[PDB]
Amino acid sequence: TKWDYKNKENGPHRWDKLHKDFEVCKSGKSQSPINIEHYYHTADLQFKYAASKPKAVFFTHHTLKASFEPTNHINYRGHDYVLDNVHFHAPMEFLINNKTRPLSAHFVHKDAKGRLLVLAIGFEEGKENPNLDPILEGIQNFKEVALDAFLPKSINYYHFNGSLTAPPCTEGVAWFVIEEPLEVSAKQLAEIKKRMKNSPNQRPVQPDYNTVIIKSSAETR
Amino acid sequence: ENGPHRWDKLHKDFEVCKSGKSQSPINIEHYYHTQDKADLQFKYAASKAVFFTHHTLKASFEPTNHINYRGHDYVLDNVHFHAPMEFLINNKTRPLSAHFVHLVLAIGFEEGKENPNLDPILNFKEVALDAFLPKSINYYHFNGSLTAPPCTEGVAWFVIEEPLEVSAKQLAEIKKRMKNSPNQRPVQPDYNTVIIKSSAE
Ligand SMILES: NS(=O)(=O)c1nnc(NS(=O)(=O)c2ccccc2)s1
Numbered sequence: 422t423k424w425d426y427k428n429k430e431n432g433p434h435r436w437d438k439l440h441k442d443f444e445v446c447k448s449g450k451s452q453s454p455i456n457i458e459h460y461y462h463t464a465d466l467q468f469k470y471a472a473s474k475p476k477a478v479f480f481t482h483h484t485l486k487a488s489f490e491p492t493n494h495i496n497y498r499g500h501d502y503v504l505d506n507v508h509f510h511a512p513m514e515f516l517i518n519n520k521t522r523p524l525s526a527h528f529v530h531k532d533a534k535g536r537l538l539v540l541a542i543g544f545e546e547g548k549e550n551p552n553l554d555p556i557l558e559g560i561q562n563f564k565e566v567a568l569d570a571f572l573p574k575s576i577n578y579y580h581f582n583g584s585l586t587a588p589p590c591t592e593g594v595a596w597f598v599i600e601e602p603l604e605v606s607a608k609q610l611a612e613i614k615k616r617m618k619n620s621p622n623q624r625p626v627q628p629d630y631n632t633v634i635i636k637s638s639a640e641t642r
Numbered sequence: 643e644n645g646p647h648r649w650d651k652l653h654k655d656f657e658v659c660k661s662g663k664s665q666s667p668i669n670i671e672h673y674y675h676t677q678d679k680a681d682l683q684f685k686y687a688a689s690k691a692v693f694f695t696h697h698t699l700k701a702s703f704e705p706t707n708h709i710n711y712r713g714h715d716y717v718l719d720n721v722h723f724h725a726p727m728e729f730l731i732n733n734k735t736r737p738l739s740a741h742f743v744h745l746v747l748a749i750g751f752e753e754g755k756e757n758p759n760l761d762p763i764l765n766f767k768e769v770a771l772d773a774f775l776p777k778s779i780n781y782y783h784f785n786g787s788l789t790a791p792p793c794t795e796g797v798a799w800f801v802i803e804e805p806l807e808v809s810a811k812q813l814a815e816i817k818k819r820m821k822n823s824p825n826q827r828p829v830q831p832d833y834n835t836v837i838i839k840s841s842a843e
Pocket residue numbers: 505506527529531539584585586587588
């Protein structure tokens with residue numbers, strides 16, 4: 422009944438076989454992740470993050486995750502989408518014109534009506550990322566998460582309609598995928614891939630039906 | 643006992659009318675503007691089957707006319723009508739719309755000067771399909787669904803903002819071929835549809 426990553430029937434091809442809830446994992450017409458390659462060039466995104474000690478930092482459902490009480494928000498089209506948690510994927514699930522990065526993080530948001538907004542940004546092999554240390558460094562009175570420092574000040578982003586990359590693979594997801602990589606050290610990566618128990622948590626690319634993707638740019642602060 | 647809030651209970655086949663997260667029609671009210679950039683091309687031709695079905699008038703033909711979008715070939719199948727127009731562009735009322743089923747192309751009709759392109763509808767007539775669409779068009783494009791059951795998702799919708807013109811008698815006359823009953827699906831919940839704005843010849 423427990424779902425997972427690799428080849429065996431408890432696999433990617435067969436999420437839908439695992440539960441009737443995960444049917445859309447097969448039946449859905451806007452499933453993510455995908456390889457983002459045809460888009461239109463052309464913003465109404467606004468940021469309310471604050472430095473916060475997590476509510477919980479825990480590995481759950483195959484992934485490392487940090488949760489927060491809802492003090493942090495994202496504003497889209499005059500609507501506020503509140504941050505509930507932040508989790509990690511390795512390697513990066515969404516591909517930008519065939520572009521994997523060893524790590525990505527996903528900011529999960531919901532609005533008043535319960536509509537979903539999710540932010541993805543990839544990581545590069547590079548200098549050490551300090552914003553990572555409160556998550557790994559510390560397990561227990563929790564340590565600050567640099568939410569205001571986490572994201573680039575300036576970003577190019579892709580916006581499109583897709584789906585959840587983990588069950589129930591729910592559609593109607595507002596996806597924002599930042600083109601700008603953040604940078605992480607190599608042992609932070611090894612340690613964190615080992616803390617995600619070193620089994621790749623990258624959902625294979627989903628079918629593409631000429632999704633409308635836009636590319637844009639914003640200030641996050 | 644055969645209604646819209648209820649399409650999903652009529653069949654298990656039709657649940658996506660309710661479970662769907664990208665259902666049409668909806669209100670086109672937030673959009674993105676963009677340049678002369680696209681791929682959309684029209685190979686319509688004057689073409690000479692007509693029948694009333696499922697609340698709707700529809701004319702279908704042989705696979706002779708097709709459209710180019712992003713390098714994919716889409717063959718036109720039929721044209722059918724909705725009154726009043728289902729999709730809304732900035733709350734834009736419209737007495738009549740038409741759906742070019744291929745990717746579906748919608749364009750509304752307004753009361754005014756008679757549309758000569760409508761009369762062959764009101765051995766079949768030549769239809770001036772080549773005369774039917776504006777040579778210059780502005781449209782809204784996004785991914786949506788069929789507006790009638792089974793409400794299939796994955797539909798490349800293109801909504802041209804430019805109105806065509808209908809007489810009142812023409813306006814009245816085919817509602818009767820639709821049995822004077824409105825075949826307009828209410829606006830569905832929207833989950834931040836990405837809409838792009840552009841224009842084509
Ligand atoms: N990979 S993905 O699409 O961002 C996610 N898949 N499942 C998730 N579960 S979750 O982040 O804990 C969550 C939390 C609140 C509402 C909905 C989902 S996020």
